[PDB]
Structures are given as C-alpha cells and as structure tokens.
Amino acid sequence: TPSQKVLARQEKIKAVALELFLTKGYQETSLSDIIKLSGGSYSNIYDGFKSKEGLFFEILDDICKKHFHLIYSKTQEIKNGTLKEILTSFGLAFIEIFNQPEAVAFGKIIYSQVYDKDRHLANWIENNQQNFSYNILMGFFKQQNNSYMKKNAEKLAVLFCTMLKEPYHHLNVLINAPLKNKKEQKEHVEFVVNVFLNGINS
Amino acid sequence: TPSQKVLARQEKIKAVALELFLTKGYQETSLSDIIKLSGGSYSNIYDGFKSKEGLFFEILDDICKKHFHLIYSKTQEIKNGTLKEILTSFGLAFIEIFNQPEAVAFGKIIYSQVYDKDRHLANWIENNQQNFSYNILMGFFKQQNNSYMKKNAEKLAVLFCTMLKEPYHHLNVLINAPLKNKKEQKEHVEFVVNVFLNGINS
C-alpha cells in the first residue's frame, strides 16, 4: 500500500526531528540536519515538513491528539456522576500531562519562538482551537442545566485549566522548577476543584 | 553630590538599553550597542550592567517596584472593607498593568531567555520573590480570621493572580493576542472574584 508507505515515511522524519530536538537542541538543529539523518526518506515532502518549525508542530499535533483522547477516555467513563467528580477526573489527567519532563521540553520550544516572523505559532493555535483539551470541559458545562454554566462554558473551561496548569508550568519552562509528584498533583486538583465549585468563603 | 551623579549616570545606561530593546529589538541589541550610545557614561560599571541580560533585569526591578507600590496604594486606602472589595481593588490594578503594550514587550524578552545558560532569569525570580505583587494579597489573607486563609495564604494569593493574568498574558506574548479594554478588564475581575469567593455552584 502506497498510502501506508507515505505515512510510515512521514513518521520517520518526525522521529528524526524529535530525536534531534532532544539530543542536539531545537535552536541548534536546522532543516538540513533533519534531511540528512532521514536519509532517502525525506524527498522535499509537501506539508509543514518544509521547515524545522512546521516539523515541530506536526509532532505537536500528534501529542495534542493523544492528550485529547486520553483525558476524554478518563472523563467519558464517568458520564453519570457529579460536576465535582468529572472535574477531578479531568483535573488528574490534565495535571499528570504537564508534570512530565516532555511537556517542559516542548514548552521551551514554544517559548523560544516568541520572536518568529513567519508566525508558525500563531497559525497553529488559531487553526487547532477545537483540538485543545479545554473543549472537553466546555461540553460538560453546556450539558448542565445551569444558565450561567451554559453561556460561560468556554470561559469557565479555560479558567479551570489555567488554575491547574499555571503558573507552575510557566515556572517549569522558564527557570526549571521541580515537577509535582502524583501526591502533590492530587493535592492541587482537590484544592482547585474546591475553590472553583464552592469558593473561598467557607 | 557624587552619589547623585552615580544614580543619574546609572539611569542613563538603563534608558539607553530600554530604548534599544524597543527600537532595535532585544535579541538584535548587544552590550557594545549599549556602551557606545551611552557615550562616556558607562565606565564598565559594576552591577548587573556587565551584560545585556542583567541590564534588562535592572530595568525590570524598577518596573516591579513601581507596580508593587501602585497596587499597594490602591488597596491600602480600603483597609476596612470586605474581602470582596480588596480583591476587586487589587484585581483592577493587577489587570490594568498586564493589559498595556509594555507588559507584552517585556514578556517577549523573558520568554526568549528560555535557553539561557547563565541563568539570569532563574537568579532574578529566586532572589526577588518578596518584591512580587502577590505578596500584597498574602498579607490580607493572613490578617483574616479564617484558618484556611491563613495557612494557604501564599497559594491563594498566587491562585487569584493567575486567574486574572493567565492565559491571556500568555497569549498576548506568544501570538500577539489583543489586549483587554478597561470595560473588558472590569468584566473579567468581577468574573474571577465571584468564582474565587462564592464558587461556581450558584
């Protein structure tokens, strides 16, 4: 099958790039570095592969798609419980992802592309808005009978994700802050969930 | 006065650097660019001025000290009201700062220093922890009679600042997202304050 040969050939270039960004560094690696180590499997391929930036976002696409279905599976197998239980189930899966050394390594790459003139970072976020994991919660807030939760569904889903993620991921990427262990992760989720649902005045 | 001549001489180098980071760009500007435009006012000065990184953090020190006393003055002249009123007064001053084109410009500089080997970003945050604006709220939570607010004072102050700041500032820096106007700022503060104090279940 030619289509299977193209896909497996594409996975090779993405595996070569991902290896080079990890062992040599993202800023140190060039396109020509990825072309050579791929061998006779590159063939000036016609997607986002025509740059080291687009190659990274092609890998980031697979990572975001894997995170989406992982959190989705952990929260869909509890579509019967309370708003608290689905928030903690989402929270634990969301906090586990960002507390891995990978999420910090990819975060450093995103942060370094702040002075990019070609706008690879701008085009990826604005076109992959539906693929982000906050959209999972957005569906749960809309299926709720509360009018406040239905109209502010996107804003509340973004808020809950921010409360868990930041500013810890922001400190991990910039100044190499220590990652939370599974006990510290569970403590922070239950802390966020309590303030989100019940507030601070109690 | 020699001491006044040193300070005014130091303000010249910081004004030259700040101008160069804005008109030429932070990554484009070197130390030698700042030395020349200063003229005969540099004299290999002995602080953080021996690098373009330390020069930026010397300017950032003045900005953070100005933000601290600005928010402090707006929240100290209401030390009698409710927890809601001091949170909204803090919130409005906190959200106003990050919704200026300056905070985005300095944010881009911080984000670009993610692969710095000398750890200028790491040494600045870890040594200026008491100068950050979240410490203002930390005092208000500790003076409160609630045991929950007293023991979690730092965590709650960091949480409230994150709810307002992120991920909007994170989007402003990376992909040039539009800044909130004063009406949008007031709407978001009252939104955060309501979820922080009372929760979501009402």
Tally of discrete structural domains of chain A: 2
Distance separating the two termini of chain A: 63 Å
- What is the top-level CATH class of the largest domain in chain A? Mainly Alpha
Structural class call of chain A reads mainly alpha
DNA-binding region (chains A, B): 30-49
Organism (chains A, B): Campylobacter jejuni
InterPro entries (chains A, B): Homeodomain-like_sf, HTH-type_Tx_Regulator, HTH_TetR
GO molecular function (chains A, B): DNA binding
Describe the 3D structure.
2 copies of one chain form a homodimer. Chain A is mainly alpha-helical. Chain A has helices at 2-25, 31-38, 52-76, 83-98, 101-112, 120-127, 134-142, 147-151, 153-165, 168-175, 182-197. Helices cover 71% and strands 0% of the residues of chain A. In chain A, α4 packs across α11 (182-197), α5 crosses α10 (168-175) and α7 (134-142) packs across α9.
